[PDB]
Design a protein around this ligand. Structure first.
Ligand code: HEM
Ligand code: HEM
Ligand code: HEM
Ligand code: HEM
Lengths: 146, 141, 141, 146
């Protein structure tokens, strides 16, 4: 993605303070809770039928971190997100058969989560930034249908 | 389509807005224009500057609109018919812009009301905003 | 949101569908399987060859499911709660797949009813399928 | 994109029967009617408040010819759709801000219109070969953001 000196500094600085154990967990749950059809891809995870179950669920918390690290790796490799996620893009889109739309919903569920967490610090200027990062990760994770 | 529970969760949440709603109106709108600047296109006759009084007044209007909407959740097309005729008939707004502003209302509510911003409320408010959204973009009169 | 004009347009087209229902539903189901191979993962137990009585039995079914929503253009949520239980609650089908079948249904209706398939009727039929999708994919019980 | 030989036959062959004078404008019209917000980008063209008015609009007919031409060009340079379409992609995205989603709705309407014109000749198998073609084109036109 394209980021100005300042926005680049914010995206990182902030990302530095992120609780790595909570966020991707909280996020994936929020994705599961809000967009309920996304639960089809996570049935082997146990009970997802309710708000609490989504956020009580251990495997949800576990897989949630698996996504957080992939965002961080991405966050270092913004200059080459297509390469970074090329294997991962094939997994979702030749083998797991996920619609690229959700990739987009999930970045946005993440941005909320970050607001929910950082407060006044997640400024519109900082969000402005992430909405650019998250668009990219999505674009990046989707280039196997080409 | 809203469940009985969505309707509980929305009213319930919205009571917990105090008279602050209009300050969330301004901010989210700001998160919009700043996060997705193609959205400004719809406001070329407006003050934007950090702190605009025009943005101050427009969010008050937008929040009050969702107040009226929370007023009538079983009959939103009726209760919003005029904003339809403005958004859908005259302005002809691309429904993507509504998803962008909804998301931006979600991001703001989560900023100031974490303890309120439960996953269960997060999901009901989203459905409330897609509904509102569906209404103002639809030509039904 | 369905305009009074839309409801009129819809009924008229289905008056003209007649007893030709299930074949279009089948053709449609066929268009979506070959046109969008991922939507077959939703059917691991079905036969898929052009013949496919199973397709036809499901085409006939999908069609009358449609026909039913037509007679209840004024409350579909209550009307198709049953199919919601299947699609929203049990199968948890990604709404995009409704946009696909939806589009493929129009590909067919346009194909066998050229004269009936005017620009105006297409709008109404497209919004109709869209409202059928929302119900089927929303959870409200 | 990547069509087979059997598909390439079927695509070319049907496309040569197309009424290049009538089909693009049919589309943009059904596009414009079925999805009214798309009228915002075409305000210059006059009263676009109804299906009739939308269908009798000479600026819509005249435009379609060009839309359909951009498509035809596609079908000759199928495996280089980026190159071919970059100039239009730079146009639509940057100076017009027409959201990607709208590219897909056009390709789809183009498919309906083909169905409408050709009946049973536009077989399920020809619907597939085309659904491949419209995506690609719409993906390429999206491609300037990305
Ligand atoms: C767009 C942001 C996303 C990122 C960064 C991401 C990342 C990942 C990663 C790193 C894995 C681990 C695979 C491995 O190396 O073993 C994974 C697996 C998986 N992803 Fe995603 N993903 C994203 C979106 C999605 C979406 C939207 C869905 C569908 C709702 C999804 C469904 C899955 C499933 C079902 C698995 C396998 C879990 C298992 O082991 O059974 N992902 N993802
Ligand atoms: C939650 C969804 C929305 C709500 C509740 C809402 C509400 C309102 C209200 C209450 C007004 C002024 C009422 C009046 O003057 O009679 C208004 C005007 C307006 N809206 Fe929205 N709106 C929404 C989404 C959008 C979006 C997505 C856009 C496009 C980016 C948009 C563009 C406009 C414009 C240009 C005006 C006129 C402002 C003026 O000139 O005074 N709206 N809206
Ligand atoms: C126009 C929209 C649709 C309508 C009106 C519709 C209607 C129906 C009907 C009438 C049934 C028969 C259920 C029964 O008798 O118990 C059914 C089942 C089913 N539907 Fe749909 N459906 C629609 C869209 C979809 C889509 C887009 C998908 C996914 C690609 C889907 C997946 C299924 C599946 C997997 C079954 C169960 C089939 C079986 O095992 O017998 N439906 N639907
Ligand atoms: C299916 C993909 C599309 C193709 C192949 C296409 C093709 C074209 C072509 C050939 C031109 C003429 C410019 C030139 O080469 O001199 C054009 C311009 C234009 N396009 Fe598209 N178009 C597509 C989709 C869209 C969509 C969805 C919209 C918005 C809803 C849009 C909005 C416009 C506008 C507003 C112009 C110029 C208007 C004017 O003449 O002043 N295009 N497009």
């Amino acid at each position: 993605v394209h980021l100005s000196g300042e926005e680049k500094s914010a995206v990182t600085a902030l990302w530095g303070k992120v609780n790595v154990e909570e966020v991707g967990g909280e996020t994936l749950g929020r994705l599961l809770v809000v967009y309920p059809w996304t639960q089809r891809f996570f049935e082997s995870f146990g009970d997802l039928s309710t708000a609490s179950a989504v956020m009580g669920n251990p495997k949800v918390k576990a897989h949630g971190k698996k996504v957080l690290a992939a965002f961080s790796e991405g966050l270092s490799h913004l200059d080459n997100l297509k390469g970074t996620f090329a294997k991962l893009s094939e997994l979702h889109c030749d083998k797991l058969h996920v619609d690229p739309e959700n990739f987009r919903l999930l970045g946005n569920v993440l941005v909320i989560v970050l607001s929910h967490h950082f407060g006044k610090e997640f400024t519109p200027q900082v969000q402005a930034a992430y909405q650019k990062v998250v668009a990219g990760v999505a674009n990046a994770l989707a280039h196997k249908y080409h | 389509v809203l469940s009985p529970a969505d309707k509980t969760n929305i009213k319930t949440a919205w009571e917990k807005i105090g008279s602050h709603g209009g300050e969330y109106g301004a901010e989210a709108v700001e998160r919009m224009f700043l996060g997705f600047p193609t959205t400004k296109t719809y406001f070329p006759h407006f003050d934007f500057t950090h702190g605009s009084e025009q943005i101050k007044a427009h969010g008050k209007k937008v929040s009050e609109a969702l107040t009226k909407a929370v007023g009538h959740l079983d009959d939103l097309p009726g209760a919003l018919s005029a904003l339809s005729d403005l958004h859908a008939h005259k302005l002809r707004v691309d429904p993507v812009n509504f998803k962008l502003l909804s998301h931006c209302l979600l991001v703001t509510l989560a900023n100031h009301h974490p303890s309120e911003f439960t996953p269960a409320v997060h999901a009901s408010l989203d459905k409330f905003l897609a509904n509102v959204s569906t209404v103002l973009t639809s030509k039904y009169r």
